[PDB]
Amino acid sequence: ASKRALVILAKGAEEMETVIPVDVMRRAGIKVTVAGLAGKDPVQCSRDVVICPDASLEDAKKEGPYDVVVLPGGNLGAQNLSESAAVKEILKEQENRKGLIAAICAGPTALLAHEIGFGSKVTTHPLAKDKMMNGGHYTYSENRVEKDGLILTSRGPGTSFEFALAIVEALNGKEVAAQVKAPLVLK
Amino acid sequence: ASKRALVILAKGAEEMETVIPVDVMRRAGIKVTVAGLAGKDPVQCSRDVVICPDASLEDAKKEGPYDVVVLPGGNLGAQNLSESAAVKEILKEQENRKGLIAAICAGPTALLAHEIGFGSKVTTHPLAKDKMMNGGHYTYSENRVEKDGLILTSRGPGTSFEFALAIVEALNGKEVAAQVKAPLVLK
Numbered sequence: 001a002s003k004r005a006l007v008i009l010a011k012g013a014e015e016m017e018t019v020i021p022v023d024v025m026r027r028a029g030i031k032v033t034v035a036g037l038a039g040k041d042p043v044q045c046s047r048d049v050v051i052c053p054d055a056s057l058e059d060a061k062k063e064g065p066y067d068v069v070v071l072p073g074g075n076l077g078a079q080n081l082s083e084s085a086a087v088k089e090i091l092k093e094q095e096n097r098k099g100l101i102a103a104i105c106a107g108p109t110a111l112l113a114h115e116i117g118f119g120s121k122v123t124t125h126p127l128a129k130d131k132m133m134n135g136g137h138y139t140y141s142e143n144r145v146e147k148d149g150l151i152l153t154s155r156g157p158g159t160s161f162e163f164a165l166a167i168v169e170a171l172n173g174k175e176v177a178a179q180v181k182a183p184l185v186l187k
Numbered sequence: 188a189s190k191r192a193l194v195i196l197a198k199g200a201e202e203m204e205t206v207i208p209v210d211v212m213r214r215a216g217i218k219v220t221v222a223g224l225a226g227k228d229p230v231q232c233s234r235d236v237v238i239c240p241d242a243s244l245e246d247a248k249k250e251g252p253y254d255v256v257v258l259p260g261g262n263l264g265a266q267n268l269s270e271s272a273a274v275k276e277i278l279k280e281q282e283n284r285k286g287l288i289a290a291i292c293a294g295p296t297a298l299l300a301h302e303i304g305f306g307s308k309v310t311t312h313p314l315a316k317d318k319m320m321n322g323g324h325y326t327y328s329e330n331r332v333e334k335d336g337l338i339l340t341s342r343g344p345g346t347s348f349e350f351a352l353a354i355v356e357a358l359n360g361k362e363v364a365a366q367v368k369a370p371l372v373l374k
């Protein structure tokens with residue numbers, strides 16, 4: 001059976017951090033659901049790219065659980081994710097079932113907000129470190145992609161391909177990740 | 188006055204090659220218009236990401252000319268660009284006025300279709316080389332980003348940041364490109 005990914009899309013999401021993982025995961029044969037936090041309607045991303053989600057979060061939740069829950073960054077997107085009780089419930093469920101949770105840039109700060117994965121080694125965007133580290137609930141890393149326990153994190157738009165390929169490797173294996181990587185013309 | 192970019196968005200465009208340049212150019216303070224080839228309606232990209240354009244191409248043309256015309260790739264997107272008389276007119280105008288033309292992945296093959304920039308050194312995705320080189324009208328390059336005469340080309344999703352930053356440098360200068368680059372966490 002194909003692996004399944006939930007990508008939660010909120011107003012102010014970083015569009016590159018949303019699109020790169022969606023696209024790369026789909027190249028890997030993962031069934032990806034782009035789920036609108038606010039509902040079914042189009043979402044205005046951080047740099048004004050407007051993306052139409054596949055489904056509302058409310059509806060996508062009914063079709064869970066997923067092999068990975070993905071939290072894009074963007075400061076205001078991450079803040080919206082952090083404020084959402086629906087996100088909290090999804091992440092708690094995913095944590096309880098020992099499923100992969102992936103977050104990039106400021107996205108990991110929603111893990112802090114929802115008390116997810118405490119004790120894990122994590123990275124974030126450099127400018128989101130202090131927020132993430134408030135209380136010392138995680139151990140900070142400067143690796144471009146980091147993975148500890150359930151929790152896969154990464155730093156910014158420029159680490160999005162590495163982040164996405166790490167998700168691919170976790171779900172579908174090293175060989176599929178290498179096959180998907182080659183045609184991308186990565187450095 | 189701010190520089191202005193036209194990004195032409197067709198069905199089957201590679202969404203990463205569309206979003207990365209739009210976002211990075213907007214970070215650079217460029218006024219970017221995402222123009223729908225087919226009209227005002229949302230566009231289904233190659234990997235099923237749906238993007239709502241800012242305007243139809245028809246309308247965006249009325250607001251030209253632009254400092255750069257950008258052609259994303261995606262094989263089927265590039266084919267749609269190649270078949271369009273409206274694209275032909277836009278590119279011919281841009282060429283006639285000695286303005287920048289930028290194209291990535293299979294995007295450069297639309298330049299061939301519309302007889303734009305013959306004689307220039309160009310790159311493409313490796314799998315689009317033979318198409319681009321039919322007739323020997325260009326000189327082929329394996330550089331990740333190439334620039335000759337009016338024509339700025341690049342290879343694939345994994346060269347999209349380099350491509351976008353080259354556009355930024357051409358329009359806004361080296362200093363702005365470096366300022367925009369740093370927070371991206373590129374390697």
Ligand SMILES: *[C@@]1(=O)C(=O)[N]C2=C(C(F)(F)F)[C]=[C][C]=C21
Pocket residue numbers: 014017073074075078104105106107125127128156157370371
């Ligand atoms: C990143 O996408 C994010 O979530 N925050 C962020 C910043 C910051 F934190 F706002 F400064 C900068 C670049 C990229 C990202």
Ligand SMILES: *[C@@]1(=O)C(=O)[N]C2=C(C(F)(F)F)[C]=[C][C]=C21
Pocket residue numbers: 183184201204260261262265291292293294312314315343344
């Ligand atoms: C690229 O985005 C493009 O336009 N074509 C392409 C391929 C190809 F050519 F179809 F094989 C592969 C990867 C990336 C791109």
Ligand SMILES: [Cl-]
Pocket residue numbers: 014046073074075076
């Ligand atoms: Cl942001």
Ligand SMILES: [Cl-]
Pocket residue numbers: 201233260261262263
């Ligand atoms: Cl393609």
